[PDB]
Amino acid sequence: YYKSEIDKNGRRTYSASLIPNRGAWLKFETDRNDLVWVRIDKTRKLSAQ
DNA sequence: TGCAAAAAACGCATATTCTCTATGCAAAAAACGCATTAATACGAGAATTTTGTAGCTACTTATACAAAATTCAGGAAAATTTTTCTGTATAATGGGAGCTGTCACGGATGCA
Secondary structure, X not given: OEEEEOXXXXXXXXXXXXXXXXXXXOEEOOOOOOOOOOEOOOOOOOOOO
16 A cells, blocks of 8 residues: 655655565655655665666 | 117136146266376496597509501592594585654754
8 A cells, every 4th residue: 555645845745555464565656756666675775667 | 771789609707727937856977086006217237339530552543655556638540421623525606584654853964
């Protein structure tokens, strides 16, 4: 699932997330700009392929 | 249902008399004295005699040297267990495991 998600000013954000009954988390997001990256068991890479 | 009143009983005249209060008799206890005998205790004699005191004597022990006949503490082997070290030869070629929902604060850096 997926964070609605909000900010320091108001203008808001979007971000996504995935986790089964057991395993990693597929997590997604929005740098203001209909962008993405993919973060999983890393929390170290604004990486989006 | 008021008594006046009669006869027999129930009350003022003595015999009887009979429990009754009253002294001399008498018989055996008792206790006192004549007293007698025996026994409870004083007198003398010399006999046992135990206790109290001295010296001798036998037992008991105070003490001075020490290796008795026995105990023990190390010392140095084994005895067996155990410990540390060294060694055994086909190929084998990048590691899993949660962190992802806390709120707020204080610097400390990075990033244009």
